[PDB]
Structures are given as structure tokens and as C-alpha cells.
Amino acid sequence: GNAKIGHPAPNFKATAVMPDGQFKDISLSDYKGKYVVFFFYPLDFTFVSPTEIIAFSDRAEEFKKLNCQVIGASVDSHFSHLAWVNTPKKQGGLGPMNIPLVSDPKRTIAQDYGVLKADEGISFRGLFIIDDKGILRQITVNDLPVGRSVDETLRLVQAFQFTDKH
Amino acid sequence: SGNAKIGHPAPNFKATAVMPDGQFKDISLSDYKGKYVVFFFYPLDFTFVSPTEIIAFSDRAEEFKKLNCQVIGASVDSHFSHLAWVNTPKKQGGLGPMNIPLVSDPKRTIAQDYGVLKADEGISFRGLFIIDDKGILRQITVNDLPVGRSVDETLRLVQAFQFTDKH
């Protein structure tokens, strides 16, 4: 991949399903001036990913207070993302989202970030912290079975911002 | 760059370390087959954030022992530098006695194999890697220099990989 600490995070432009339930083409560069947490998950309609997605969405206000945009992504189509959003939570759906969910059907974004599981065409659980100047500050990659922690992500974002001002 | 890939064998190394008994010993990652390994880099000895991380992992080594997990720290400093830092009491800004080995990577080849060498400064980023008992890399963590790592989070991850290994 091209994700290197201290270098500009690779830009992307891709269709996302937005919090209002509509599709929009967004770019990482849209969020210059804010910190960004950009995380990949393997596939829609799975059982580890919804715990993570719902936690980041439920707690989006805590990232807002850190002037930090959270963006999720997977190789599944944006239509599949919306289908999972519209599935009732009591049946295993995501429910309404406070974060956008990017579609990476060409796998080029996952490749740019070095998190494509090449033998299976899906992303590992990659999470990237990008500062307000677009510079990559933190790389996290978990193998497929093991989820990430919103608490840890908030600790990291806040710590980078504090040390930025030092 | 680097050869650290999730789901592939973690890059082996053979290097001089300062062991918990305070003596030099050449160790290899493959020595620890059969155990989980947390392998972490820090930029260089005799600094300010790194000792807090090193001491935290050393102080809490028993919690990794209870998970059949070996913790190993590393930097590009010489093995004499590591020993001097250990021999400096914590009261005076040193590490004090350690419960974990500290690997010396003076040729920078281990940092390069793990993709954490910061070009031009000849130091490693704050890289941390979780390797299972088969030697397979399961987790990559890399922090830019100013921000340290969490022992709690590392234990959460080791526990979760061992949990999911059961199915």
C-alpha cells in the first residue's frame, strides 16, 4: 500500500451511504481541516462488524467534540450498505447511522491502504487516524475475527491532538 | 515497505537482547513458537515517552504470562545502551529491572522487516505486533512518535485472538 506514517494519507473518491440514507460521492480531501478516523470492515451482514459500526455511530458525538469525522468502508456495494442500514436492528440490522459508509467495489482503496486480504478480495480490519492536514498518524490492522475499540480510538485521536499543540 | 503481513508468518529475527536477569542473550522470534508474542518497537533509549511504555509492559508482564504470551521490546540502540538504561534506577530516570527482554536492532533490519523504520532518522516508529503461537502475524499497530500505546488495549487484543482461535 501507500499508507505511510507522516505522509499524506492516500486520497479516495467513492460512493458512500450518508447518515440521511442517501448516496453521495465523497473524498477524504473533503475533510481537510478535521481529524479523520477511516476504518475498513470486511463485509456487510456479518457479526463482528455491526458491533464496531454501531459503536462508532452511537458514539459519533464524542468524535464530533474532538473535531473528528469517522468514516467506515468495505468492498460491498453502497446498495448493500443501505440494505443493512434499513434492516431493523431487532433482526440484526445496523439501523440509522451517524457516520458515512464508503463502498470500495474495485478494492483500490483497500489496496492503497495496504489492508486488502489478497486471497479473498476483502479488507482486513484496518483503521487509520488522519490529522487535519491530511497526514497519516496511526495505523491499526486486525485480522478478520477481532474487533476494534472506540475507547482506544478516542484515546489515540485525543492524544495526537494534544501532542500537536505541544 | 516491510514483510509484515497479516495471516503470514511474522518476519523472523535473531538479535542480542538484554534478558530479565540483566544479561545479554541472542534470541530469535522462533524461540517462542507455542506462545503468543507481543513484539513492540520504540524509537530510542533514554527518552521520555518510551520508558513509560516499557515499564508498563514490564510491570504487567504477569498478565501476559497468564495468557501464555511473551512480551518483547526492541529498538535500534545497541545492547550496551539497553543494559545501561536497565541499570539506571527508575528513581533516576532509568528503566530499572525488567520482566521482559529488550532486543537490539543496530543494523535496522528488524525495523525494516516490520515496516516501522522512519527513514532519515534511523529510528523506528511506535510499532506493536501480535503474533500467535503458530508464528502468524495477527495484528499491526503503528503510532507516530508522540503518542504511546496502552497495555489494556494490548491485553484486550491478545485475549480476543485467543478467544477466536477456539472456533
Curated annotation (Swiss-Prot), chain A:
Task: Identify residues that carry Phosphothreonine.
Answer: 87
Keywords from the named record:
Acetylation, Antioxidant, Cytoplasm, Disulfide bond, Isopeptide bond, Oxidoreductase, Peroxidase, Phosphoprotein, Redox-active center, Ubl conjugation
Recorded catalytic reaction(s): these are: a hydroperoxide + [thioredoxin]-dithiol = an alcohol + [thioredoxin]-disulfide + H2O
Which residues carry the post-translational modification N6-acetyllysine, per the record?
4, 13, 24, 32, 133
**Catalytic EC class:** oxidoreductase
Induction comment from the UniProt entry of this chain: Constitutively expressed in most human cells; is induced to higher levels upon serum stimulation in untransformed and transformed cells.
- GO terms for biological process, alphabetical: canonical NF-kappaB signal transduction; cell population proliferation; cell redox homeostasis; erythrocyte homeostasis; fibroblast proliferation; hydrogen peroxide catabolic process; leukocyte activation; natural killer cell activation
**Domain spans labelled Thioredoxin:** 3-162
Question: Can you locate the Glycyl lysine isopeptide (Lys-Gly) (interchain with G-Cter in SUMO2) cross-link?
Answer: 4, 117
Q: Where is the protein situated, by its record's location annotation?
A: Cytoplasm; Melanosome
EC number in record:
1.11.1.24
- Describe its partners and assembly state: Homodimer; disulfide-linked, upon oxidation. 5 homodimers assemble to form a ring-like decamer. Interacts with GDPD5; forms a mixed-disulfide with GDPD5. Interacts with SESN1 and SESN2. Interacts with FAM107A.
**What is this protein's function per UniProt?**
Thiol-specific peroxidase that catalyzes the reduction of hydrogen peroxide and organic hydroperoxides to water and alcohols, respectively. Plays a role in cell protection against oxidative stress by detoxifying peroxides and as sensor of hydrogen peroxide-mediated signaling events. Might participate in the signaling cascades of growth factors and tumor necrosis factor-alpha by regulating the intracellular concentrations of H(2)O(2). Reduces an intramolecular disulfide bond in GDPD5 that gates the ability to GDPD5 to drive postmitotic motor neuron differentiation.
Name of this chain's protein = Peroxiredoxin-1
User: To which species is this protein native?
Assistant: Homo sapiens (Human)
Which region of the full protein is contained in this chain?
Answer: 4 to 169 of 199
Curated annotation (Swiss-Prot), chain B:
Keyword Oxidoreductase in annotation: yes
Which of the residues bear the PTM N6-succinyllysine? Answer: 33
> Glycyl lysine isopeptide (Lys-Gly) (interchain with G-Cter in SUMO2) cross-link position in this chain?
5, 118
Give its localization.
Cytoplasm; Melanosome
| Keywords, sorted A to Z | Acetylation, Antioxidant, Cytoplasm, Disulfide bond, Isopeptide bond, Oxidoreductase, Peroxidase, Phosphoprotein, Redox-active center, Ubl conjugation
Where, per the database record, does this protein carry Phosphoserine? 30
Q: How is it modified after translation?
A: Phosphorylated on Thr-88 during the M-phase, which leads to a more than 80% decrease in enzymatic activity. Acetylation increases reducing activity and resistance to superoxidation. Deacetylated by HDAC6 which decreases reducing activity.
Keyword match Ligase: no
Which positions does the record annotate as the modified residue Phosphothreonine? 88
* Catalysed transformations (reactions): a hydroperoxide + [thioredoxin]-dithiol = an alcohol + [thioredoxin]-disulfide + H2O
Q: What is the effect of changing residue 88 to A?
A: Abolishes phosphorylation by CDK1; 30% reduction in enzymatic activity
State any GO CC term.
nucleus
- EC number(s) per entry: 1.11.1.24
A GO BP annotation? cell redox homeostasis
Which positions are catalytic residues?
50 (cysteine sulfenic acid (-soh) intermediate)
Q: Where is the Thioredoxin domain?
A: 4-163
Q: Name one GO molecular function term.
A: identical protein binding
In the induction comment, the record states: Constitutively expressed in most human cells; is induced to higher levels upon serum stimulation in untransformed and transformed cells.
- The enzyme class is oxidoreductase
Modified sites of kind N6-acetyllysine: 5, 14, 25, 33, 134
Q: What is the effect of changing residue 88 to D?
A: 87% reduction in enzymatic activity
The Swiss-Prot or TrEMBL record describes its family as follows: Belongs to the peroxiredoxin family. AhpC/Prx1 subfamily.
Q: State the function annotated in the UniProt record.
A: Thiol-specific peroxidase that catalyzes the reduction of hydrogen peroxide and organic hydroperoxides to water and alcohols, respectively. Plays a role in cell protection against oxidative stress by detoxifying peroxides and as sensor of hydrogen peroxide-mediated signaling events. Might participate in the signaling cascades of growth factors and tumor necrosis factor-alpha by regulating the intracellular concentrations of H(2)O(2). Reduces an intramolecular disulfide bond in GDPD5 that gates the ability to GDPD5 to drive postmitotic motor neuron differentiation.
Misc note = The active site is a conserved redox-active cysteine residue, the peroxidatic cysteine (C(P)), which makes the nucleophilic attack on the peroxide substrate. The peroxide oxidizes the C(P)-SH to cysteine sulfenic acid (C(P)-SOH), which then reacts with another cysteine residue, the resolving cysteine (C(R)), to form a disulfide bridge. The disulfide is subsequently reduced by an appropriate electron donor to complete the catalytic cycle. In this typical 2-Cys peroxiredoxin, C(R) is provided by the other dimeric subunit to form an intersubunit disulfide.
Subunit structure of this chain's protein:
Homodimer; disulfide-linked, upon oxidation. 5 homodimers assemble to form a ring-like decamer. Interacts with GDPD5; forms a mixed-disulfide with GDPD5. Interacts with SESN1 and SESN2. Interacts with FAM107A.
Query: What is the name of this protein?
Result: Peroxiredoxin-1
Q: Which organism's genome codes for this protein?
A: Homo sapiens (Human)
Provide the gene name from the record: PRDX1
> Which residues of the intact protein are shown?
3 to 169 of 199
